[PDB]
């Protein structure tokens, strides 16, 4: 019965850090998707706007 209090806390502490890792996963993946889009948009627009205007 003393062991089962210890196991019931260890089981709750394990799912608590699994739960934490899952919320972190969503936020980290979101930042990676956003950063991919920011780089492509900024570089593509700046290059095209300089290039077409100068040629014309």
């Amino acid at each position: 019965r003393t062991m089962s209090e210890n196991l019931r806390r260890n089981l709750a502490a394990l799912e608590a850090k699994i739960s934490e890792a899952k919320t972190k996963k969503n936020m980290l993946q979101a930042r990676a998707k956003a950063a991919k889009a920011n780089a492509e948009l900024q570089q593509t627009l700046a290059a095209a706007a300089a290039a077409a205007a100068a040629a014309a």
Binding site: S4, L7, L11, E15, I18, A21, K22, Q29
Partner: protein, 55 residues
């Protein structure tokens, strides 16, 4: 032994190339899926300790 160390290096080079081939973001969510079933294994064993305590 020397040939054990050399043997593990040729085997490790091929294994590391396969580890490079999969996307770390996909492998990280596979690791979370794997970690969720690891908690599924722990709850069955822990619950059986309650049954054994009651026995």
């Amino acid at each position: 032994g020397l040939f054990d160390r050399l043997g593990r290096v040729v085997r490790a080079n091929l294994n590391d190339l396969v580890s490079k081939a999969e996307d770390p973001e996909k492998v990280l969510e596979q690791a979370v899926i794997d970690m969720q079933e690891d908690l599924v294994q722990l709850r069955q064993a822990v619950a059986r300790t309650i049954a054994e305590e009651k026995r």
